Design a protein around this motif. Structure first.
Motif, mmCIF file in Angstrom:
data_model
loop_
_atom_site.group_PDB
_atom_site.id
_atom_site.type_symbol
_atom_site.label_atom_id
_atom_site.label_comp_id
_atom_site.label_asym_id
_atom_site.label_seq_id
_atom_site.Cartn_x
_atom_site.Cartn_y
_atom_site.Cartn_z
ATOM 1 N N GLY A 128 0.792 -1.236 0.000
ATOM 2 C CA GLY A 128 0.000 0.000 0.000
ATOM 3 C C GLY A 128 0.820 1.279 0.000
ATOM 4 O O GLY A 128 0.290 2.346 0.313
ATOM 5 N N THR A 129 2.102 1.178 -0.358
ATOM 6 C CA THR A 129 3.015 2.320 -0.320
ATOM 7 C C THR A 129 3.401 2.774 -1.730
ATOM 8 O O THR A 129 3.766 1.949 -2.571
ATOM 9 N N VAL A 130 3.318 4.083 -1.985
ATOM 10 C CA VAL A 130 3.649 4.621 -3.312
ATOM 11 C C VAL A 130 5.144 4.927 -3.473
ATOM 12 O O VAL A 130 5.687 5.805 -2.799
ATOM 13 N N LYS A 131 5.798 4.179 -4.362
ATOM 14 C CA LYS A 131 7.137 4.515 -4.840
ATOM 15 C C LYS A 131 7.023 5.638 -5.867
ATOM 16 O O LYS A 131 6.601 5.421 -7.003
ATOM 17 N N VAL A 132 7.399 6.843 -5.456
ATOM 18 C CA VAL A 132 7.405 7.993 -6.365
ATOM 19 C C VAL A 132 8.827 8.465 -6.714
ATOM 20 O O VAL A 132 9.591 8.914 -5.854
ATOM 21 N N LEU A 133 9.170 8.321 -7.991
ATOM 22 C CA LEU A 133 10.464 8.724 -8.513
ATOM 23 C C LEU A 133 10.423 10.219 -8.810
ATOM 24 O O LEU A 133 9.448 10.719 -9.383
ATOM 25 N N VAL A 134 11.479 10.928 -8.412
ATOM 26 C CA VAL A 134 11.565 12.376 -8.624
ATOM 27 C C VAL A 134 12.926 12.860 -9.128
ATOM 28 O O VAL A 134 13.947 12.186 -8.969
ATOM 29 N N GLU A 135 12.909 14.024 -9.767
ATOM 30 C CA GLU A 135 14.113 14.728 -10.177
ATOM 31 C C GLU A 135 14.027 16.139 -9.599
ATOM 32 O O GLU A 135 12.986 16.804 -9.718
ATOM 33 N N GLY A 136 15.119 16.583 -8.972
ATOM 34 C CA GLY A 136 15.197 17.927 -8.411
ATOM 35 C C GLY A 136 15.429 18.951 -9.502
ATOM 36 O O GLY A 136 16.174 18.698 -10.453
ATOM 37 N N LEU A 137 14.792 20.111 -9.375
ATOM 38 C CA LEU A 137 14.957 21.162 -10.371
ATOM 39 C C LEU A 137 15.827 22.324 -9.875
ATOM 40 O O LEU A 137 16.939 22.504 -10.373
ATOM 41 N N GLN A 138 15.332 23.100 -8.906
ATOM 42 C CA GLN A 138 16.062 24.268 -8.384
ATOM 43 C C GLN A 138 15.713 24.554 -6.940
ATOM 44 O O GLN A 138 14.586 24.308 -6.518
ATOM 45 N N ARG A 139 16.668 25.095 -6.184
ATOM 46 C CA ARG A 139 16.408 25.431 -4.776
ATOM 47 C C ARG A 139 15.624 26.739 -4.576
ATOM 48 O O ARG A 139 15.712 27.666 -5.389
ATOM 49 N N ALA A 140 14.843 26.786 -3.497
ATOM 50 C CA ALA A 140 14.006 27.943 -3.178
ATOM 51 C C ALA A 140 13.847 28.096 -1.672
ATOM 52 O O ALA A 140 13.827 27.104 -0.944
ATOM 53 N N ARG A 141 13.737 29.343 -1.218
ATOM 54 C CA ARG A 141 13.596 29.659 0.206
ATOM 55 C C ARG A 141 12.117 29.774 0.651
ATOM 56 O O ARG A 141 11.246 30.222 -0.109
ATOM 57 N N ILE A 142 11.853 29.339 1.881
ATOM 58 C CA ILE A 142 10.545 29.487 2.513
ATOM 59 C C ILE A 142 10.395 30.911 3.060
ATOM 60 O O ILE A 142 11.164 31.327 3.934
ATOM 61 N N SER A 143 9.420 31.656 2.534
ATOM 62 C CA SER A 143 9.013 32.939 3.119
ATOM 63 C C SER A 143 8.223 32.654 4.392
ATOM 64 O O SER A 143 8.561 33.141 5.475
ATOM 65 N N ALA A 144 7.162 31.866 4.232
ATOM 66 C CA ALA A 144 6.422 31.270 5.333
ATOM 67 C C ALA A 144 5.624 30.110 4.766
ATOM 68 O O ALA A 144 5.097 30.186 3.649
ATOM 69 N N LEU A 145 5.566 29.023 5.524
ATOM 70 C CA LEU A 145 4.747 27.876 5.152
ATOM 71 C C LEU A 145 3.475 27.837 5.999
ATOM 72 O O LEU A 145 3.307 28.643 6.921
ATOM 73 N N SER A 146 2.577 26.912 5.670
ATOM 74 C CA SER A 146 1.285 26.819 6.340
ATOM 75 C C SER A 146 0.744 25.395 6.331
ATOM 76 O O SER A 146 0.624 24.773 5.271
ATOM 77 N N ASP A 147 0.421 24.883 7.516
ATOM 78 C CA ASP A 147 -0.211 23.571 7.635
ATOM 79 C C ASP A 147 -1.706 23.686 7.312
ATOM 80 O O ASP A 147 -2.543 23.865 8.206
ATOM 81 N N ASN A 148 -2.024 23.594 6.021
ATOM 82 C CA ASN A 148 -3.397 23.693 5.540
ATOM 83 C C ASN A 148 -4.121 22.357 5.643
ATOM 84 O O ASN A 148 -4.367 21.694 4.635
ATOM 85 N N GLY A 149 -4.454 21.970 6.871
ATOM 86 C CA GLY A 149 -5.172 20.727 7.121
ATOM 87 C C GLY A 149 -4.251 19.534 7.268
ATOM 88 O O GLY A 149 -4.035 19.045 8.378
ATOM 89 N N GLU A 150 -3.714 19.064 6.143
ATOM 90 C CA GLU A 150 -2.842 17.882 6.124
ATOM 91 C C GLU A 150 -1.485 18.216 5.511
ATOM 92 O O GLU A 150 -0.436 18.022 6.138
ATOM 93 N N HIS A 151 -1.530 18.721 4.281
ATOM 94 C CA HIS A 151 -0.345 19.115 3.523
ATOM 95 C C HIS A 151 0.142 20.510 3.920
ATOM 96 O O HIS A 151 -0.401 21.134 4.836
ATOM 97 N N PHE A 152 1.163 20.993 3.221
ATOM 98 C CA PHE A 152 1.789 22.263 3.560
ATOM 99 C C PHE A 152 1.788 23.232 2.379
ATOM 100 O O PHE A 152 2.334 22.932 1.320
ATOM 101 N N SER A 153 1.164 24.390 2.565
ATOM 102 C CA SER A 153 1.248 25.464 1.585
ATOM 103 C C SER A 153 2.437 26.351 1.919
ATOM 104 O O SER A 153 2.745 26.556 3.096
ATOM 105 N N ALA A 154 3.114 26.858 0.890
ATOM 106 C CA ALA A 154 4.297 27.689 1.101
ATOM 107 C C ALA A 154 4.641 28.624 -0.052
ATOM 108 O O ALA A 154 4.298 28.377 -1.212
ATOM 109 N N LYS A 155 5.319 29.705 0.316
ATOM 110 C CA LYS A 155 5.939 30.649 -0.597
ATOM 111 C C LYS A 155 7.388 30.780 -0.071
ATOM 112 O O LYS A 155 7.626 30.392 1.073
#
Length: 239
Positions: free
Chosen positions: A80-107
């Motif tokens: 029942g576990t998802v193997k998700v393959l990823v490639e990194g693109l570019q780094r970015a800084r957190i202005s502020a994040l937000s716990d919107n229920g479950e996941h995280f919103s951020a700028k």
């Protein structure tokens, strides 16, 4: 550039630009957003947490900087576990994040800051490839050919991220390499990491060799001496 996307915490990894890795996700709180981002231009923000790799990370538990990374696949697994393959693109800084229920919103940011004097950096690059070359020789877990395959590649930023990715850095160093914007500084840091390692691997090798010679000398002594017995015995049993 300001970007407003969701954040997936990584327990103990740092994903560098142009680095491909399988992430294994099994939380009721991740996959649902890994899907909603899947059909949202395929791009994810990857931020690693810190001390106490706590399974329920808060909002202060993340580092300031992360990687925007595209999704190469998703694959449900027998358990029942998802193997998700990823490639990194570019780094970015957190202005502020937000716990919107479950996941995280951020700028909201983007990596883009080089240095002056490309003569120094030419040398420093050559020194780095050359140190890596001698490093794989002592490491040997690393394909001797991705050295030479990216021996060609021009990009110093990419050179440093390739070296970081292929070395067994502790998290703190992993992130500090991500957090360094000056490509020269991270190349010199990683060259400090390699050298440290290399020394360590030379100490360990010498030790392993003293130890092997001892095991072999001791074993042979025991054999020679089980010989002496077995002969003295056969001799007594004669006249």
């Amino acid at each position: 550039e300001r970007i407003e996307i969701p954040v997936l915490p990584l327990r103990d990894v740092v994903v560098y630009p142009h680095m491909v890795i399988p992430l294994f996700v099994g939380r009721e709180k991740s996959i649902r957003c890994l899907e909603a981002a899947m059909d949202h231009d395929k791009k994810i923000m990857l931020v690693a947490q810190k001390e106490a790799s706590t399974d329920e990370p808060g909002v202060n538990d993340l580092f300031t900087v992360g990687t925007v990374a595209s999704i190469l696949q998703m694959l449900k697994l027998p358990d029942g576990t998802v193997k998700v393959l990823v490639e990194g693109l570019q780094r970015a800084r957190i202005s502020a994040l937000s716990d919107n229920g479950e996941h995280f919103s951020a700028k909201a940011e983007y990596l883009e800051s080089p240095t002056i004097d490309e003569r120094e950096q030419e040398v420093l690059v050559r020194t780095a490839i050359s140190q890596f070359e001698g490093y794989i020789k002592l490491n040997k877990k690393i394909p001797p050919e991705v050295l030479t395959s990216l021996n060609s590649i021009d990009d110093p930023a990419r050179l440093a991220d390739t070296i970081a990715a292929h070395m067994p850095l502790k998290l703190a160093d992993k992130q500090s390499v991500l957090e360094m914007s000056d490509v020269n500084e991270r190349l010199e840091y990683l060259m400090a990491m390699m050298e440290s390692e290399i020394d360590l691997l030379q100490v360990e090798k010498r030790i392993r060799n003293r130890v092997k010679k001892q095991m072999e000398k001791s074993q042979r002594e025991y054999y020679l001496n089980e010989q002496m017995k077995a002969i003295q015995k056969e001799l007594g049993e004669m006249d």
